[PDB]
C-alpha cells in the first residue's frame, strides 16, 4: 500500500468544483492517515513552456539545442531548473498521484500539459529501454479526476463528440502508463455546470469514499510490454506468435491496440484485464 500521495490540480479558481474536488481528496486521504502534498499549478505561478531556461548549467551544444538530450543530461549532472527539481522530488516521494482538472478541448489544460513536458524528463520519468511495464513510476498508481461541460451521452459510442475512451487514451496510455504508472479508473464528472447543488455535494462524497480504498483498486488493462519485440530493429512491434494468437480474438487488446477490431468496452474507463 501507499502512505504518501501527490495531488496535481490544474484550475485557476479557489471557488470551482475542481478546487472543491481537490480539497475533498485532501481531507479524505489525510483522514485515512495518508500524507498529502499538492501541486496547485496556478498557485505556484508554474511555467509550462519547455526551453533551455530549464537547464541552469552549461548546455552541451548551444549551436543546435536538443531539449530531450540536454534536459536528460541536466537530470544527471544536476543542472535542472529549481522548480522542476522540486516537482520531481514530490513525485519520487509520492505513491499515488491524482490529476485533478477540467476537460479542455478534449484534453488536459495547457498548463498541465507543460507540467508533464518539463517534469517528465528522460531517465527520470522514462527510459527508452524500460518503457510502459518497466517504466520508472511502475510502483506508483495514478488517477484522473476530470470534469466536463458536455454530458456523458455526448461521449458515448453514439454521442456526437465520440468515444471518451478514445479521448483519455493519449493521456492515460501515452503519458501515464508510458512512464510505468498503473492508471486507476478515471473519476469522470460530466456536465458539472448542469448539476443541482444537492447532486454536486454527493459527488464530493462519492469521490471521498472511493479514496478510502483507492489503493486496493483494480487498475486499467494495458497490453503488457511482453507482447512486443522491444528493439529499434524490430520496430517495437507485437511478437509474431502474438500477432497470430491474437487473430482469433473478437476484440482488440485496448483502445490503442484495437488491431483493426472491436475495441474492448471502456478499456480506459473500466478495469478488468
Ligand X SMILES: Cc1cc2nc3c(=O)[nH]c(=O)nc-3n(C[C@H](O)[C@H](O)[C@H](O)COP(=O)(O)OP(=O)(O)OC[C@H]3O[C@@H](n4cnc5c(N)ncnc54)[C@H](O)[C@@H]3O)c2cc1C
Binding site residue list for FAD: 11, 17-18, 66, 103-106, 147-150, 155, 200
Quote the CA–CA distance of 83 and 192 in Å, as a whole number: 32
Residues with Cβ < 8 Å from 148, sequence gap 6 or more?
A: 102, 103, 155, 188, 189, 190, 191, 192
Asked whether position 42 contacts ligand 340 by CB under 6 A, the answer is no
- Helix 17-31, helix 197-211: angle, nearest 10: 30
Binding mask 234-273 for ligand 340 (x = CB under 6 A): ----------------------------------------
37 binds, among ligand X, a second copy, ligand 340, none (CB under 5 to 8 A by kind): none
**8: how many CB neighbours lie within 10 A of its CB?**
23
Active site residue: 19, 161, 162, 221, which one?
Answer: 161
Nearest to ligand X of 148, 268 (CB atom): 148
Residues 60-119 interacting with ligand 340 (rule: CB under 6 A): 68, 105
Task: State which H helix or E strand residue 83 sits in.
Answer: helix 82-93
Quote the CA–CA distance of 87 and 172 in Å, as a whole number: 20
Select the residue interacting with a second copy from 73, 167, 184, 192 (CB under 8 A): 167
Cell of 4: 504518501
Active site residue 149: yes
Cell of 101: 482538472
Asked whether position 206 contacts ligand 340 by CB under 6 A, the answer is no
Asked whether position 46 contacts ligand 340 by CB under 6 A, the answer is no
Select the residue interacting with a second copy from 4, 60, 90, 113 (CB under 8 A): 113
- CA 83 and chain centroid, separation: 20
Active site residue 258: no
Residues with Cβ < 8 Å from 126, sequence gap 6 or more?
A: 120, 135, 136, 178, 179, 180
Nearest to a second copy of 89, 236 (CB atom): 236
| CA 252 to each of CA 164, 218, 223, 231, 257: distance values in angstroms, whole numbers, following the listed order | 17, 20, 10, 23, 6
Active site residue 177: no
Asked whether position 213 contacts a second copy by CB under 8 A, the answer is no
Nearest to a second copy of 200, 261 (CB atom): 261
Q: Enumerate binding residues for ligand 340 (CB under 6 A).
A: 68, 105, 122, 126, 128, 131, 149-150, 178, 193
The residues assigned a catalytic role are 149, 155, 161
Amino acid at each position: 500500500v501507499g502512505r504518501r500521495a501527490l495531488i496535481v490540480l490544474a484550475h485557476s479558481e479557489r471557488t470551482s468544483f475542481n478546487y472543491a474536488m481537490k480539497e475533498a481528496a485532501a481531507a479524505a486521504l489525510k483522514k485515512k492517515g495518508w500524507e498529502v502534498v499538492e501541486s496547485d499549478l496556478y498557485a505556484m505561478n508554474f511555467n509550462p513552456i519547455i526551453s533551455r531556461k530549464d537547464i541552469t548549467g552549461k548546455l552541451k551544444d548551444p549551436a543546435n539545442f536538443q531539449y530531450p538530450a540536454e534536459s536528460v543530461l541536466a537530470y544527471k549532472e544536476g543542472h535542472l531548473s529549481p522548480d522542476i527539481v522540486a516537482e520531481q522530488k514530490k513525485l519520487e516521494a509520492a505513491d499515488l498521484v491524482i490529476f485533478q482538472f477540467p476537460l479542455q478541448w478534449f484534453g488536459v489544460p495547457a498548463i498541465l500539459k507543460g507540467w508533464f513536458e518539463r517534469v517528465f524528463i528522460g531517465e527520470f520519468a522514462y527510459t527508452y529501454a524500460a518503457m510502459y511495464d518497466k517504466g520508472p513510476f511502475r510502483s506508483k498508481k495514478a488517477v484522473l479526476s476530470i470534469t466536463t461541460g458536455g454530458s456523458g451521452s455526448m461521449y458515448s459510442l453514439q454521442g456526437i463528440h465520440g468515444d471518451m475512451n478514445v479521448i483519455l487514451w493519449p493521456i492515460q496510455s501515452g503519458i501515464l502508463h508510458f512512464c510505468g504508472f498503473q492508471v486507476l479508473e478515471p473519476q469522470l464528472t460530466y456536465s458539472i455546470g448542469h448539476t443541482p447543488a444537492d447532486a454536486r455535494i454527493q459527488i464530493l462524497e462519492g469521490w471521498k469514499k472511493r479514496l478510502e480504498n483507492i489503493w486496493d483498486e483494480t487498475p486499467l488493462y494495458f497490453a503488457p510490454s511482453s507482447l512486443f519485440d522491444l528493439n529499434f530493429q524490430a520496430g517495437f512491434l507485437m511478437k509474431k506468435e502474438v500477432q497470430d494468437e491474437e487473430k482469433n480474438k473478437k476484440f482488440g487488446l485496448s483502445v490503442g491496440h484495437h488491431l483493426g477490431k472491436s475495441i474492448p468496452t471502456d478499456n480506459q474507463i473500466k478495469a478488468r484485464k
